[PDB]
Amino acid sequence: TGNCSAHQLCLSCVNSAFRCHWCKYRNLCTHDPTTCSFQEGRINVSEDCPQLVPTEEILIPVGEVKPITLKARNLPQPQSGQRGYECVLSIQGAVHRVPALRFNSSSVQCQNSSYQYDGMDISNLAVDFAVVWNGNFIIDNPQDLKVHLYK
Numbered sequence: 001t002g003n004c005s006a007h008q009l010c011l012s013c014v015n016s017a018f019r020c021h022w023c024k025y026r027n028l029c030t031h032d033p034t035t036c037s038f039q040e041g042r043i044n045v046s047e048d049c050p051q052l053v054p055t056e057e058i059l060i061p062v063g064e065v066k067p068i069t070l071k072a073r074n075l076p077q078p079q080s081g082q083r084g085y086e087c088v089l090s091i092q093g094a095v096h097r098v099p100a101l102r103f104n105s106s107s108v109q110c111q112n113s114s115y116q117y118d119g120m121d122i123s124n125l126a127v128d129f130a131v132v133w134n135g136n137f138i139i140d141n142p143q144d145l146k147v148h149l150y151k
């Protein structure tokens with residue numbers, strides 16, 4: 001027994017021993033699935049959670065306008081008034097937000113941007129990033145995927 005609400009993302013939530021459900025449009029974990037917005041928002045097992053899936057090295061050359069195309073599963077369609085998708089990258093301690101597009105439930109793309117980083121001897125920089133929607137609803141990234149900027 002415990003507060004399902006303490007789980008911050010879907011995968012932790014549905015894997016809880018507390019017996020919890022994830023509300024994908026409200027972005028919260030609950031013991032009572034009736035607190036989700038509607039039935040289709042209720043996630044009960046990990047395979048149904050929104051998540052990025054394993055992919056080969058995401059390689060973006062510095063100083064060139066490029067999109068970043070990410071493979072996923074179960075990405076939610078925003079409800080009325082909810083904001084869409086963004087990529088949030090931490091590059092050497094600074095946060096960059098890039099507009100993104102959900103092409104479908106299995107594909108999200110950070111839209112065209114150029115990227116830079118400091119360091120003449122770093123030929124390939126691993127960058128922490130999140131895909132979010134509605135400002136701060138984070139998509140689970142269980143394989144710990146990184147963006148790799150390269151020189």
Ligand SMILES: *[C@@H]1O[C@H](CO)[C@@H](O)[C@H](O)[C@H]1NC(C)=O
Nearest residue numbers: 001002003004005006029031
């Ligand atoms: C924790 O769960 C109890 C129900 O067992 C509830 O009364 C309380 O509001 C919950 N707290 C939070 C912060 O969700």
Ligand SMILES: *[C@@H]1O[C@H](CO)[C@@H](O)[C@H](O)[C@H]1NC(C)=O
Nearest residue numbers: 064065066067111112113114
């Ligand atoms: C993205 O940027 C490249 C390079 O500037 C450009 O050639 C391409 O047309 C752009 N694509 C979109 C969809 O804006």
Ligand SMILES: *[C@@H]1O[C@H](CO)[C@@H](O)[C@H](O)[C@H]1NC(C)=O
Nearest residue numbers: 102103104105106107108109
């Ligand atoms: C999802 O969108 C991408 C990009 O447009 C496309 O390549 C892919 O085939 C789509 N997948 C499905 C199942 O529609």
Ligand SMILES: [Cl-]
Nearest residue numbers: 025026037041
């Ligand atoms: Cl919901």
Ligand code: NA
Nearest residue numbers: 024025027137
């Ligand atoms: Na969500």
Ligand code: NA
Nearest residue numbers: 052141142143
């Ligand atoms: Na992942």
